[PDB]
């Protein structure tokens, strides 16, 4: 599972957007008297010629900036978490079912637990939605939508089949011992001198 | 639940990521130029506040691709709170921090460097790192410093944060121009190099000279950055033989290795203050012509009353 732009792009491009939205009002020329006041016989310094001091002139202080990055620091962070969830499916191509079988061998019946959360793990998945939107960041799980579906469904089918096979074996035990004990009770020897 | 254990335990071969290399430096010191030239493009775009560069480090020996997070910070002190975005307790143990000392203006190096000596320190305590972890990282960094094969002392790592620190000084080529345009003596270069080495020794830092114009040690800087943040193989020796470009590995520094640099200059003792030895760059821009105030009507009429009075 790759990212065609790596997750760092999701933050870098948003930073470039914020930089554009700053420079749209920041790179404005500074009003100056040098038009005729040639007595400043010196190349206009960039810090003063382009008016690069507006950030120190916040009416509300730096809080806006503290807010701005915060939004990004939120927007990227959780969505990377979302990406992380997708990366969690990486096992579907490199995992040994024998390890799972040994770890959960003879669970409640055979597994009875993880097979329940697998259906929930089918979330972020198996929906008509093709691309997850979040703010201006859209992650398109279009190339994997079918491949991970096939792999996950095959693994689900094999796990379900093994669960059912063990379930049926235990039900052979179930019904066989019921029948035997029912016959033993149906001997019905209630009155006897012995 | 159960899945988050079962699938997670099925981990494969990988290379560690999520490293946050940090860059504080004096504003206008070409820090963005240096790092952009490092990452491959000639130069990105500058701006205000924190800026992001994702450094793409590829290891051909293992043939893998990874990205580190260059969070380059503005030189304005007013933009120091937003540094709380740069370093977190989750990110601290893998942060490598470098300064940009614009050698074209040596007179503004040390204190700006010493400006570091406050900011990060404040940020490293206001985030309230528990003593146990900060001590363990500190001793781990100390041990890593000790074992440099190609040291103990009174002031070695006498004050440090336990994370790798570099002091890279850009615009190296300018040393030539200020050599002639300022008659800046070679003994001055020796003095500033010794002072910077003492600084990097007390913070356990590795110091690298570089010039984007002369593209010197950029490959070496890349090698050292990757070697420190990741642990790649390193083979470059301590290039200190020539003054033009000097490379001090973190651990190669010793007090005697600075006394040897002390001896060859005999003009002014190094114990004297930094700014005393270096010459100040005089301010060029003249003061604006004074306000030509007009005497208001009231005191003018007072003076005219007096004039009509003595007559």
UniProtKB/Swiss-Prot annotation, chain A:
Residues with N6-acetyllysine modification: 157
UniProt subcellular location: Cytoplasm, Cytoskeleton
Function of the protein: Cytoplasmic dynein 1 acts as a motor for the intracellular retrograde motility of vesicles and organelles along microtubules. Dynein has ATPase activity; the force-producing power stroke is thought to occur on release of ADP. Plays a role in mitotic spindle assembly and metaphase plate congression.
Family, per entry: Belongs to the dynein heavy chain family.
Subunit structure: Homodimer. The cytoplasmic dynein 1 complex consists of two catalytic heavy chains (HCs) and a number of non-catalytic subunits presented by intermediate chains (ICs), light intermediate chains (LICs) and light chains (LCs); the composition seems to vary in respect to the IC, LIC and LC composition. The heavy chain homodimer serves as a scaffold for the probable homodimeric assembly of the respective non-catalytic subunits. The ICs and LICs bind directly to the HC dimer and dynein LCs assemble on the IC dimer. Interacts with DYNC1LI1; DYNC1LI1 and DYNC1LI2 bind mutually exclusive to DYNC1H1.
Disease linked to the protein: Charcot-Marie-Tooth disease, axonal, type 2O: An axonal form of Charcot-Marie-Tooth disease, a disorder of the peripheral nervous system, characterized by progressive weakness and atrophy, initially of the peroneal muscles and later of the distal muscles of the arms. Charcot-Marie-Tooth disease is classified in two main groups on the basis of electrophysiologic properties and histopathology: primary peripheral demyelinating neuropathies (designated CMT1 when they are dominantly inherited) and primary peripheral axonal neuropathies (CMT2).
Domain-level remarks: Dynein heavy chains probably consist of an N-terminal stem (which binds cargo and interacts with other dynein components), and the head or motor domain. The motor contains six tandemly-linked AAA domains in the head, which form a ring. A stalk-like structure (formed by two of the coiled coil domains) protrudes between AAA 4 and AAA 5 and terminates in a microtubule-binding site. A seventh domain may also contribute to this ring; it is not clear whether the N-terminus or the C-terminus forms this extra domain.
Name the UniProt record assigns to this protein: Cytoplasmic dynein 1 heavy chain 1
Source organism per UniProt: Homo sapiens (Human)
Protein encoded by which gene: DYNC1H1
Shown chain mapped onto the complete sequence: 969 to 1162 of 4646
From Swiss-Prot, chain B:
GO biological process: cellular response to nerve growth factor stimulus; centrosome localization; microtubule cytoskeleton organization; microtubule-based movement
Main location: cytoplasm
Cell location: Cytoplasm, Cytoskeleton
Transmembrane segments: none
Superkingdom in the source lineage: Eukaryota
Alphabetized UniProt keyword annotations: ATP-binding, Cytoplasm, Cytoskeleton, Dynein, Methylation, Microtubule, Motor protein, Nucleotide-binding, Phosphoprotein, Transport
Keyword Chaperone: no
GO cellular component: centrosome; cytoplasmic dynein complex; cytosol; dynein complex; kinetochore; late endosome; membrane; microtubule
A molecular-function term among this protein's GO annotations: ATP binding
Residues annotated as binding ATP: 25-32
Subunit structure comment from the entry: Homodimer. The cytoplasmic dynein 1 complex consists of two catalytic heavy chains (HCs) and a number of non-catalytic subunits presented by intermediate chains (ICs), light intermediate chains (LICs) and light chains (LCs); the composition seems to vary in respect to the IC, LIC and LC composition. The heavy chain homodimer serves as a scaffold for the probable homodimeric assembly of the respective non-catalytic subunits. The ICs and LICs bind directly to the HC dimer and the LCs assemble on the IC dimer. Interacts with DYNC1H1; DYNC1LI1 and DYNC1LI2 bind mutually exclusive to DYNC1H.
Family: Belongs to the dynein light intermediate chain family.
Primary role: Acts as one of several non-catalytic accessory components of the cytoplasmic dynein 1 complex that are thought to be involved in linking dynein to cargos and to adapter proteins that regulate dynein function. Cytoplasmic dynein 1 acts as a motor for the intracellular retrograde motility of vesicles and organelles along microtubules. May play a role in binding dynein to membranous organelles or chromosomes.
UniProt name for this protein: Cytoplasmic dynein 1 light intermediate chain 2
Organism, scientific name: Homo sapiens (Human)
Gene this chain is encoded by: DYNC1LI2
Parent sequence residues shown: 37 to 373 of 492
